């Protein structure tokens, strides 16, 4: 509902779940989306630490 300020930004941990971003295809559209150490087309076959 409400986000944090840039100078006092927030940080929360994600663990013990399944990353399936297809559920965002009908609710949210993103103007910017860039990844750095991995390819966007390989995210479905990986695990994250």
């Amino acid at each position: 509902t409400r986000f944090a300020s840039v100078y006092a930004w927030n940080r929360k941990r994600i663990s013990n779940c399944v990353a399936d971003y297809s559920v965002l295809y009908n609710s949210a559209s993103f103007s910017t989306f860039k990844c750095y150490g991995v390819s966007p087309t390989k995210l479905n076959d990986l695990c994250f630490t």
């Binding site: 295809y25 559209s29 103007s31 989306f33 390819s39 966007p40 995210l43």
Partner: protein, 49 residues
């Protein structure tokens, strides 16, 4: 061997028209090859559509 392909999408999905992209349009609607040779053109059409 020249071909010209045309369609209409929304504004923030224009970034998905690239060889190695993921998302709603790059997955189920229109995909480009990795060894692509060509040019990609877009422009706003809020007056017409």
């Amino acid at each position: 061997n020249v071909y010209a392909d045309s369609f209409v999408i929304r504004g923030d999905e224009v970034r998905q028209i690239a060889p190695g992209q993921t998302g709603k349009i790059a997955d189920y609607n229109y995909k480009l090859p990795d060894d692509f040779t060509g040019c990609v053109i877009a422009w706003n059409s809020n007056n017409l559509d």
